[PDB]
């Protein structure tokens, strides 16, 4: 069946055309913050938490089953713009 130490979180992107592939570098600043910052490859994102109405089921392909009721992170791409030239 599928299961409802570690937590699992869906990351959803405002721009669904951005390509994130395996081997791409991934890091997060502030997963505990209301607005985490995520870096993937050379791209940066700012996240916002959102609670969809309903439940997610996540099912694995053949890798070497989850039921998620909690929040997902909604990520918009950002530019890091110097406040002063």
């Amino acid at each position: 069946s599928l299961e409802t130490d570690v937590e699992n979180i869906v990351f959803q992107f405002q721009n669904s055309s951005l390509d994130f592939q395996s081997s791409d570098d991934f890091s997060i600043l502030g997963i505990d913050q209301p607005h985490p910052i995520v870096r993937i490859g050379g791209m940066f994102f700012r996240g916002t938490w959102h609670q969809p109405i309903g439940t997610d089921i996540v099912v694995p392909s053949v890798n070497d089953g989850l039921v998620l009721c909690k929040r997902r992170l909604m990520l918009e791409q950002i530019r890091l713009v110097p406040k002063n030239p």
């Binding site: 979180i9 990351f11 081997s23 890798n63």
Partner: protein, 106 residues
């Protein structure tokens, strides 16, 4: 930092709730039906299909087919103690039941 893994998943965006697990899984035809639906999505993506039935004993209820799509969603596993990222995996396909006209709620 950490590199995104090879692991992949399918995601079902269900509009109801898992308080009654058996009833909940049954709305999609049961656990085996869910696994069959996920396996098809990987073996033959174009053919992927899943049906939702929230009110099985109600003769006016119309079972609904998911809209199937890919985005670039990721599944992020974090170790609860230190909030460190243990794993990142791609969600390669999504079965979209939320946000169809039937299940809208505001």
């Amino acid at each position: 930092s950490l590199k995104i893994s090879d692991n992949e998943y399918a995601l079902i965006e269900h509009p109801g709730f898992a308080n009654n697990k058996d009833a909940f899984f049954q709305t999609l035809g049961g656990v085996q039906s869910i696994q069959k639906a996920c396996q098809t999505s990987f073996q033959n993506p174009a053919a992927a299909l899943l049906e939702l039935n929230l009110r099985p004993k109600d003769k006016y209820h119309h079972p609904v087919q998911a809209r199937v799509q890919s985005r670039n969603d990721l599944l992020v596993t974090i170790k609860k103690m230190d909030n460190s990222v243990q794993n990142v995996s791609r969600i390669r396909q999504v079965f979209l039941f939320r946000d169809m006209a039937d299940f809208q709620y505001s």
